[PDB]
Symmetry: C2
Subunit: 125 residues, 2 copies
């Protein structure tokens, strides 16, 4: 369950693809409270419900009861069905207890977890 606001959009029938300028996604839970806020410079949405996010990707927790507060990266990928989140770029995770840097990232918006794959550096080391 989500809401998608963008300035500008282009839809092409034969490709079933939507191009968004300055998208701002907002995800809602079961009681319908805003939980996550995803934004980027440009986004591409395919018919199988993949959302490709491009340039200055920023994920923000909108609920106080989540240990993971912010994800920042250059490019990201969201599957709107399984709520999964991946990235192939350099990623920064902001949690309440520490911050992380590393290459590659795999997480989920429902389970509120996020992992880094390679070259992990943490702000408490």
């Amino acid at each position: 369950s989500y809401r998608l606001i963008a300035q500008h959009v282009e839809y092409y029938s034969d490709q079933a693809v939507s191009w968004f300028t300055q998208p701002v996604l907002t995800t809602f839970d079961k009681d319908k409270i805003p939980t996550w806020s995803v934004k980027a410079d440009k986004a591409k949405l395919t018919n199988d419900r993949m959302l490709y996010l491009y340039g200055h990707v920023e994920v923000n927790a909108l609920v106080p009861d989540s240990q993971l507060r912010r994800i920042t990266t250059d490019n990201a990928q969201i599957n709107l069905v399984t709520q999964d989140v991946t990235s192939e770029d350099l990623v920064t995770l902001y949690r309440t207890t520490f911050n992380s840097s590393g290459l590659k990232m795999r997480g989920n918006l429902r389970s509120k977890n996020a992992e880094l794959i390679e070259k992990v550096r943490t702000s408490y080391e």
Copy 2:
């Protein structure tokens, strides 16, 4: 039959599969992938059934020379993006190579380039 959809602002709600457009411009294509019609309005709503409701200064323009119907003008209109059937329940104006007409209500199809007024007809003839 292909269509292209361009807008300056967009709001999507996944719970109803509706989306609101600001300043939309719709291009429709014929059998041969040739842009045939251009549709502009102030605001539009797109349902999951692929019905598009247009509100405010609706204007359908012809993009090809071989067409008797040149322009439609009405306050609000409804288009089916699959069948290309077109309706209005407001005051409508039809511009043709033959003559121009005004009337109340309208019923047409953009693929076959047909358009009829229903009541209160006033022609250029």
